[PDB]
Amino acid sequence: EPLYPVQVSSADARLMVFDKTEGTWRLLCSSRSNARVAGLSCEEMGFLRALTHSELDVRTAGANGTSGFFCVDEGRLPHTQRLLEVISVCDCPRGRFLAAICQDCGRRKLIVGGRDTSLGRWPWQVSLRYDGAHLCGGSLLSGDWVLTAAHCFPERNRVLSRWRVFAGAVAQASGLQLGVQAVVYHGGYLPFRPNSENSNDIALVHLSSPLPLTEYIQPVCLPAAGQALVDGKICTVTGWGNTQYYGQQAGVLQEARVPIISNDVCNGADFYGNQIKPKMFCAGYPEGGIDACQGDSGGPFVCEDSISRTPRWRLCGIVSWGTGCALAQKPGVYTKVSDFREWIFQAIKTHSEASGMVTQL
Numbered sequence: 017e018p019l020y021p022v023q024v025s026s027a028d029a030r031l032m033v034f035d036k037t038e039g040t041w042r043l044l045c046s047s048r049s050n051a052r053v054a055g056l057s058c059e060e061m062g063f064l065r066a067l068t069h070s071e072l073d074v075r076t077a078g079a080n081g082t083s084g085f086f087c088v089d090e091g092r093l094p095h096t097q098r099l100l101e102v103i104s105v106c107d108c109p110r111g112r113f114l115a116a117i118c119q120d121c122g123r124r125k126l127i128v129g130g131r132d133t134s135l136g137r138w139p140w141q142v143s144l145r146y147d148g149a150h151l152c153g154g155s156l157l158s159g160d161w162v163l164t165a166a167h168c169f170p171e172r173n174r175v176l177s178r179w180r181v182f183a184g185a186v187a188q189a190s191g192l193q194l195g196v197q198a199v200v201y202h203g204g205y206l207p208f209r210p211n212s213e214n215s216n217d218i219a220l221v222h223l224s225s226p227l228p229l230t231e232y233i234q235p236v237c238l239p240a241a242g243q244a245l246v247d248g249k250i251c252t253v254t255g256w257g258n259t260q261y262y263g264q265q266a267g268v269l270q271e272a273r274v275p276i277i278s279n280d281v282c283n284g285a286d287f288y289g290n291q292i293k294p295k296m297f298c299a300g301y302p303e304g305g306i307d308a309c310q311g312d313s314g315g316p317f318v319c320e321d322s323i324s325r326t327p328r329w330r331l332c333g334i335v336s337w338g339t340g341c342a343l344a345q346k347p348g349v350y351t352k353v354s355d356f357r358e359w360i361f362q363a364i365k366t367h368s369e370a371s372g373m374v375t376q377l
């Protein structure tokens with residue numbers, strides 16, 4: 017597990033960044049911009065936000081395994097997308113440094129050809145229902161925000177008073193069921209605007225009230241900044257979708273394990289013939305048999321790593337589309353979440369108070 021270059025102490029929340037030139041960790045020198053440095057640092061690592069921050073003092077706190085300090089270029093800060101771009105080594109005379117409490121995520125506090133799952137195993141999984149029926153899955157990013165697919169909201173399914181967000185249970189008939197205040201969908205999603213090309217198949221659901229965080233309801237993390245999708249890696253897709261294309265929805269949330277498939281193979285004529293656009297990837301088996309399906313759309317494709325020095329699940333894909341379900345040489349296609357990190361943050365930063373359907377290019 018090659019560590020992410022930005023870390024946050026589980027003990028006291030100190031932020032630490034890696035020095036390429038020396039192999040050491042350095043603290044971040046406190047400054048007038050502590051708040052954005054905090055948020056930016058959480059964003060960087062793949063957490064949604066900094067809930068709170070504070071100043072620590074090396075006289076009362078210890079270096080705790082760090083050699084010196086980085087300083088943040090506050091002029092560049094508000095315009096950077098990368099923390100690693102705005103820091104330089106500095107003396108930090110006053111020995112005061114930054115700590116940040118991030119919105120925790122990716123951690124447990126306990127579909128075709130998959131298995132019945134248990135409660136708390138996938139606590140970010142939500143069911144998105146219109147008029148009483150399950151149409152789509154989604155993934156909690158906080159208690160009030162859900163990441164799902166744009167295609168879940170075509171013309172007829174745009175009356176928000178009719179959507180509900182079901183969380184906290186794995187059986188469809190069990191749990192908490194809340195309203196929706198807004199939907200921010202991607203304006204680069206050509207079909208919503210003919211019909212087209214499924215790039216930018218991504219939307220955010222803002223619930224009219226936040227869910228409690230429990231052992232059954234937790235957010236997922238996001239891919240950290242610059243984090244690559246690793247081909248062949250086995251990740252997990254879950255949902256209440258159909259267990260055969262021409263079948264019934266699962267009554268109990270299912271899970272299935274599927275490897276990432278390189279675009280080399282997936283774009284191949286044997287497979288998808290150049291239909292796999294660069295913000296999409298495929299996952300599944302050349303043989304077929306295990307796949308997501310109708311009604312898993314919007315739900316989580318999650319991959320577990322240890323790059324934050326503790327095991328974490330991160331939402332690497334969103335169930336977008338496929339030609340049938342579980343077909344040999346037709347794997348699942350997913351939205352590449354890492355490619356929409358700044359879009360997710362901008363949307364939430366901009367449309368937090370909005371109501372209705374909002375387009376964000």
Ligand SMILES: N=C(N)c1ccc2[nH]c(-c3cccc(C4(O)CCCCC4)n3)cc2c1
Pocket residue numbers: 151152167168307308309310311312313335336337338339340341342346347348349
């Ligand atoms: N093999 C796969 N991985 C895969 C993934 C995702 C998939 N969605 C569908 C499909 C087919 C007909 C209608 C729909 C609706 O999207 C259902 C939700 C609301 C709008 C209409 N989805 C197939 C399919 C296959």
